[PDB]
Amino acid sequence: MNYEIKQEEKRTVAGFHLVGPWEQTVKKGFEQLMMWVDSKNIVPKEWVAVYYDNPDETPAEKLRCDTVVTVPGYFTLPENSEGVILTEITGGQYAVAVARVVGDDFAKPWYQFFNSLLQDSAYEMLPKPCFEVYLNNGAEDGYWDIEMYVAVQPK
């Protein structure tokens, strides 16, 4: 599928870090995230899932992912925010792709993106976590539009 390279600034993110199979942790993490966001009246810039491992190579028990919201760099963590991490997603060049998910196959767009990026004659993927921004609320629209980011550098 299609994509283009963009120069991104770093992102300050707040939320939860989870270890284990994504079939359970991703959903779990976002549930905790929504409860926290609502309780603190936080206004997120983005709802994001960050992936640190390849699920076809790293054992499921060791998989890591973050379910967080992108906030301003000057964000002050609200009082009584136990268990919440506050860290950064680095800036740099990222290949960016947009896709629509109808159903529960959220892995499909990622596979399509990686296969297409592997054929790029000008850029190569870097050993950095990849992430996706959930553009809309699919729990209400019936479909999820996602924006995938994969770190790259010139070949």
CA distance 3 to 25: 28
CA distance 150 to 136: 20
Contact 46, 132 (CB under 8 A): no
92-101 and 64-71 strand pairing: unpaired
Contact 148, 96 (CB under 8 A): yes
**Residue of 65, 70, 63 lying closest to 87 (CA atoms):** 70
Beta carbons within 10 angstroms of residue 98's beta carbon: 16
- Note the CATH number of domain 1-155: 3.20.80.10
> Solving technique for this entry?
X-ray
* CB proximity list for 154: less than 8 A, separation 6 or greater: 122, 123, 124
CA distance 126 to 115: 15
Contact 45, 68 (CB under 8 A): no
Contact 93, 8 (CB under 8 A): yes
Structural domain spans, the chain: 1-155
Contact 114, 56 (CB under 8 A): no
